[PDB]
Design a protein around this ligand. Structure first.
Ligand SMILES: Nc1ncnc2c1ncn2[C@@H]1O[C@H](COP(=O)(O)OP(=O)(O)OP(=O)(O)O)[C@@H](O)[C@H]1O
Ligand SMILES: Nc1ncnc2c1ncn2[C@@H]1O[C@H](COP(=O)(O)OP(=O)(O)O)[C@@H](O)[C@H]1O
Ligand SMILES: [Mg+2]
Ligand SMILES: [Mg+2]
Lengths: 421, 50, 539, 141, 53, 141, 53
């Protein structure tokens, strides 16, 4: 057969005409709504912006997950790995991040909106059609691109869909807007890259992976940058998802992406079945931007939350003896357990950040000490649904719990009825 | 209490010796499987070049 | 004379020279590439072909593209003209302050000095960190390694070293960022503009730091030679200017990793865990150049990534023998919240001879390691039973060692941006006395969390009375009119009118600047003249 | 160093030189064994000779074994360490006593080179790192 | 597993009705391709399986 | 031995002869299965057939899998043990009963060849080593 | 070890005796045959031994 060269290194349509569309790993739309209209073809392998092109990650990116807006805070421009085993809440944490941006794009100006890109690599078309049904039912599709190289696609299409999805998301970074790319199963991209490289007879290494499977993932992930004010000031926030096997994060691709990304949201399958959902392992979860890009007010209450959960973890593996009361360990064995069941959250319902920091204020200052441990998820509804909803309106605008507010909302959490007596 | 503690720790030293017996057998399987895995990856990389 | 590209496999290019091949390590310039693509000759393949590693990406290379030999290895600017600049692997400025002044143009490839020009002088380097200066003191003129897995604090510890050692230092410093994140290379740059270490513009000669960056986005050819470029800038200050240089290498693991990413494509059958057969010799040939000779001195600080906290991996395990002081950072210490997470019973220095630091420092260091190894030996019981079966003989060695673990913790000046506590610099005379006191029993009555995150032994007594003040604050601060609605705060109905209502435009401003391009539905290919025609209907 | 020779193949030296340095030092040490005097030889990091011999073997395209060592890496250390002998009185009665130094990784003496040299030599001196920080220095287990 | 799927795909696509496809040991599809690919001249993947698993 | 055939491929025989003797023995017993009679076959140590077949695969430079076994080591025993059938009345009504024998290592029934044959055979007679040393013989689990 | 057998096989087959053959460390016979298979380029079996173990 004849092979014609096209003269072109691999291109995808980037632009504002991709928002709302479901494309494949090369840019062709698969949603059956016609060609992409208001787009232009940019390259797929773009060099990451250098040292001078960037600035520090200061403004936050609210996920709506209480365990990550408090414990593992994420800024606009950082790379936060969601690593965990199978069926532990990795997609659900990432989907809640996309759904929340719709809830926050209607309340911010045009320069503050976050445009999500979901890259689905190696999943089924049944799963991706469930997501587009979900992102249309919520309304998140008018901000979301869906790049979908599923399992029936060729291994070069699943290898290129993170890069082709990033080039679409780099349009918003390079034009002063803010992007959020989620690379779901970056573990499945490396499997497609391994297949494509073993058939090209490039010699295999550890777990038969190529030698350049680090450079496969670092040159993708370093494109998520917070740009400087000379370059529009835009940002791209990456959420790579790596699946582990029986919690073994010493595996080859997990150790590569852990060392590339800034933070990591480690989810466990034993915390998942203790009812802790999202199943965030607070000890192993890190964010290397840290509280430099946290919501203030949430930052004021997270120090009481990060410290008490540190003592609640070491008091555990002594908690099997409720005959052995101590009343100092037993003080924090219940106080951290108020905090643990504070951080539980139902999925596909992200919370605004101001409603979260009030709920962490209600448990770090001891307002929920009277309620039992088994009825705090109903008590957090009692805190939210019974306070004045103007406490959230001035906390969002002032941006921190002002001295004219922490005595307002001190007595506001006293005129609520908590399900425990 | 001291005779019950003498019998509760002859059941525990016994049970932590049968648990350790099942852990050294499983480690020795994972030890042997690690050398076969490392070897097969080295042979597959040498055969790709040679 | 020139050579042409015959083969491109990833980041590895074969170039064919019809007569007069270049030497190995020679630099080649690819003519006609968009970016300046530099190849470095790795080996002679055998049929007038050399095999190269590319310092930039190879997408856009054509077989037959001309390649110009330079007759020399990669040559970088050296001297005073590079201070305050950011250099590439190939010596190019990426700081956007214009071209670089050249005192000389040195090759990045060198031999290690000799056995005869070695300086056998062990003298202490006062760091300011309690766990470092006590249990593994650093050598002025020697090689220091900060081992740790991902997220234990090697980048923070090397940031604390940059502003505690290189800030008050007579000579110059070079930071060779070898294959880490580009974000924290921009963090390190802007930290040094505002601290005055790098002075921009017309004060450029007053800078005391050269940055060489080879970060994670770059191909494995760049990340393997950028440590050699950052070493050449420090080897010029050591040899030609004859002065005490500091070389901070962030993640020397990435030097060995970037060699591993190309070595299978260089025709080498793989070694153990995934590394090249030349692992100890690539790493050895670099580290033998970072030495204090009789001319000058290079005190090097090398962060070493330890993959998955496994110190038995051959890339951290080979670089143990190249160092004078190893600072093993542990994940176990960081899960207790103790920072810097230096493992006290895994960090080692050659400076811990009592012939060098004296026996008064040596015994409080060996005594702290003795009491902390004993506590590790006692956690087999007191994490199962509960500190009741020890008859107060070694109940006291637990509460001595538990205060010691918190007293090794220390706030950092650079961790002020993370945590809300000021930085603490401790003198060496203070940390011996503060650690002799807990070792002997001069501070047996203070609580253990008064030792946590303090400067020195005056700051544990200044924290202990603060704890026993604020226990008594929790008995009347709640009512009886101090936190009332009417005392010092306004009303809630008014505060919602106070705040300025920002304007939401709900039109997101996307296509108001966007220059589009019409997408061809049909595939556009090239005919034999190279003209972009439709794909023919011949199938 | 009136009685000491130092054969030094350092880390920047070529991997054939680090492979050949234990054999070069043993030939200098066998002068004393063969002339009725007594020798003592310390091969510090014999586990670094074997990595140097692995590097030359994999680059010469010799077939790898476990941990990618060549098939003759036992024969490498056994033909070096059997030169340490106590000669009979008709050969002068001289002797050469070796002290190879193997660095393990977290005490794992079931690793491939450590297993080979344990089989060759007439006993080990173990040095645990838990006894080292327990105050027992020399940390002889 | 492709022959039995094709019978099930006809009742779904053409007959347009709900069918049940019970496949006993779909692993033996994967294992059978791994026996063939050793002889198709391929570098093996992880544990010994085909690169295109 | 009036009714028994003995097909022996001992430890000194070549590995293709040990690989073939289960199939040679099964063809001799399929004579009785196909002519309406009844057959019993005992492949003592199918553990040792697969090791002989692993030898032929690694000497044929074929890529190995779990415990360096070939990918078709399942099909080795699957092709063999499916021939032990009970035929229909139109084929004669003959039968062949197989007793494959697998030696485990430390009670590990989750080995590769062990679990291969557990998924081939109908039943399983697991003989235990703790019951055997207590005198309970046949040491049936 | 085969040389020790052949001296011992003369005392069995020609002298007609009961011979004791002491093979000191039969494991070293295994590991020396494991080395000569690695030198003849043969692909080793499980934990590292020769395919003809
Ligand atoms: N916070 C939560 N509360 C309740 N259920 C949750 C929560 N998060 C996830 N789940 C549910 O747990 C299951 C886990 O699936 P999830 O979407 O988290 O995928 P995953 O485990 O990351 O990925 P994979 O499907 O590849 O294993 C789903 O049924 C999901 O709906
Ligand atoms: N001295 C310290 N004080 C407080 N937190 C620290 C300290 N050192 C490290 N950390 C925490 O650990 C994380 C590790 O950061 P970094 O040094 O970049 O990791 P790595 O050493 O893996 O490069 C930091 O983001 C910070 O949150
Ligand atoms: Mg998922
Ligand atoms: Mg770092």
């Amino acid at each position: 057969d004849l092979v014609y060269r096209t003269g072109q290194i691999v291109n995808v349509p980037i632009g504002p005409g991709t928002l709302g569309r479901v494309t494949d790993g090369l840019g062709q739309p698969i949603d059956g709504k016609g060609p992409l209209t208001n787009v232009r073809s940019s390259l797929v392998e773009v060099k990451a912006p250098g040292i001078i092109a960037r600035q520090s990650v200061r403004e936050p990116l609210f996920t709506g997950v209480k365990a990550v807006d408090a414990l593992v805070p994420i800024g606009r421009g950082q790379r936060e790995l969601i690593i965990g085993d199978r069926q532990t809440g990795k997609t659900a944490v990432a989907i809640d991040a996309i759904i929340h941006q719709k809830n926050c794009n209607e309340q911010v100006p045009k320069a503050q909106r976050v445009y999500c890109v979901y890259v689905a690599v190696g999943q089924k078309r049944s799963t991706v059609a469930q997501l587009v049904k979900l992102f249309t039912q919520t309304g998140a599709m008018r901000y979301t691109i869906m790049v979908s190289a599923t399992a029936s696609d060729a291994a070069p299409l699943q290898f290129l869909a993170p890069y082709s999805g990033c080039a679409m998301a780099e349009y918003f970074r390079d034009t002063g807007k803010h992007g959020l790319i989620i690379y779901d199963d970056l573990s499945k991209q490396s499997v497609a890259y391994r297949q494509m490289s073993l058939l090209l007879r490039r010699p295999p290494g550890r777990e038969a992976f190529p030698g350049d499977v680090f450079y496969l993932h670092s040159r993708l992930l370093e494109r998520a940058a917070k740009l400087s004010k000379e370059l529009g000031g835009g940002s791209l926030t990456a959420f790579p998802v790596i699946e582990t096997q029986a919690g073994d994060v010493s595996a080859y691709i997990a150790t590569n992406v852990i060392s590339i990304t800034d933070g990591q949201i480690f989810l466990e399958t034993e915390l998942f079945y203790k009812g802790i959902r999202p199943a965030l392992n607070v000890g192993l979860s890190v964010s290397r931007v840290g509280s430099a890009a946290q919501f203030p007010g949430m930052k004021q209450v997270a120090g009481t939350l990060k410290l008490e959960l540190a003592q609640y973890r070491e008091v555990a593996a002594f908690a099997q003896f409720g005959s052995d009361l101590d009343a100092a360990t037993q003080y924090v064995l219940e106080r951290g357990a108020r905090l643990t069941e504070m951080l539980k959250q139902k999925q596909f319902a992200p919370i605004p950040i101001e409603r979260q920091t009030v709920a962490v204020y209600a448990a770090t200052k001891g307002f929920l000490d009277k309620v039992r441990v088994q009825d705090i998820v109903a008590a957090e509804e009692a805190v939210i649904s019974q306070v004045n909803p103007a406490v959230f309106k001035i906390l969002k605008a002032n941006g921190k719990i002002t001295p004219a507010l922490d005595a307002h909302l001190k007595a506001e959490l006293r005129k609520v009825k908590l399900p425990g007596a | 209490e001291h005779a019950s503690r003498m019998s509760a720790m002859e059941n525990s030293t016994k049970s932590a010796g049968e648990m350790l017996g099942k852990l050294t057998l499983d480690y020795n399987r994972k030890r042997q499987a690690t050398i076969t895995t490392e070897l097969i990856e080295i042979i597959a990389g040498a055969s790709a070049l040679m | 004379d020139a050579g042409y590209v015959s083969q491109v496999i990833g980041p590895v290019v074969d170039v064919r020279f019809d007569g007069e091949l270049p030497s190995i390590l020679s630099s080649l310039e690819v003519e006609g590439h968009s970016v300046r693509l530099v190849l470095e000759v790795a080996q002679h393949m055998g049929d007038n072909t050399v095999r190269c590693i590319a310092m930039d990406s190879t997408d856009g290379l054509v077989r037959g593209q001309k390649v110009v030999d330079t007759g020399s290895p990669i040559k970088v600017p050296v001297g005073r003209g590079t201070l305050g600049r950011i250099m590439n692997v190939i010596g190019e400025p990426v700081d956007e302050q214009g071209p670089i002044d050249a005192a000389d143009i040195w090759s990045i490839h060198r031999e290690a000095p000799e056995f005869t020009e070695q300086s056998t002088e062990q003298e202490i380097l006062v760091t300011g960190i309690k766990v470092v200066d006590l249990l593994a003191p650093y050598q002025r003129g020697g090689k220091i390694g900060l081992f740790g897995g991902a997220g234990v604090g090697k980048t923070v510890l090397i940031m604390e070293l940059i502003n505690n050692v290189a800030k008050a230092h007579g000579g110059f410093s070079v930071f060779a960022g070898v294959g880490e994140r580009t974000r924290e290379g921009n963090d390190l740059y802007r930290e040094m503009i505002e601290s005055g270490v790098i002075k921009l513009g017309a004060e450029r000669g007053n800078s005391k730091c050269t940055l060489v960056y080879g970060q994670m986005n770059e191909p494995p050819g760049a990340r393997a030679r950028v440590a050699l470029t950052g070493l050449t800038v420090a080897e010029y200050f050591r040899d030609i200017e004859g002065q005490d240089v500091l070389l901070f290498v962030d993640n020397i693991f990435r030097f060995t990793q970037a060699n591993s990413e190309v070595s299978a494509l260089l025709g080498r059958i793989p070694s153990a865990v995934g590394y090249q057969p030349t692992l100890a010799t690539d790493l050895g040939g670099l580290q033998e150049r970072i030495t204090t000779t009789t001319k000058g001195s290079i005190t090097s600080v090398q962060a070493v990534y330890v993959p998955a906290d496994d110190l038995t991996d051959p890339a951290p395990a080979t670089t143990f023998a190249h160092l004078d002081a190893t600072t093993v950072l542990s994940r176990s210490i960081a899960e207790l919240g103790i920072y810097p997470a230096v493992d006290p019973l895994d960090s080692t220095s050659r400076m811990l001879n009592p012939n060098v630091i004296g026996a008064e420092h040596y015994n409080v260091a060996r005594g702290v390691q003795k009491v902390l190894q004993d506590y590790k030996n006692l956690q087999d019981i007191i994490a199962i039973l509960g500190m009741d079966e020890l008859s107060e003989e070694d109940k006291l060695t637990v509460a001595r060692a538990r205060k010691i673990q918190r007293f090794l913790s220390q706030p950092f000046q650079v961790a002020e941006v993370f945590t809300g506590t000021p930085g603490k610099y401790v003198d060496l005379a203070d940390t011996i006395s503060g650690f002799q006191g807990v070792l002997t029993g001069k501070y047996d009555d203070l609580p253990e969390m008064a030792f946590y995150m303090v400067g020195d032994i005056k700051e544990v007594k200044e924290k202990a009375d603060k704890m026993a003040k604020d226990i008594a604050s929790r008995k009347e601060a709640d009512n009886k009119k101090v936190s009332e609605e009417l005392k010092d705060i306004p009303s809630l109905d008014k505060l919602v009118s106070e705040i300025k209502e920002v304007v939401i435009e709900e039109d997101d401003g996307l296509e108001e600047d966007f220059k589009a391009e019409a997408l061809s539905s049909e595939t556009v290919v090239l005919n034999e003249e190279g003209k972009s025609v439709p794909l023919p209907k011949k199938n």
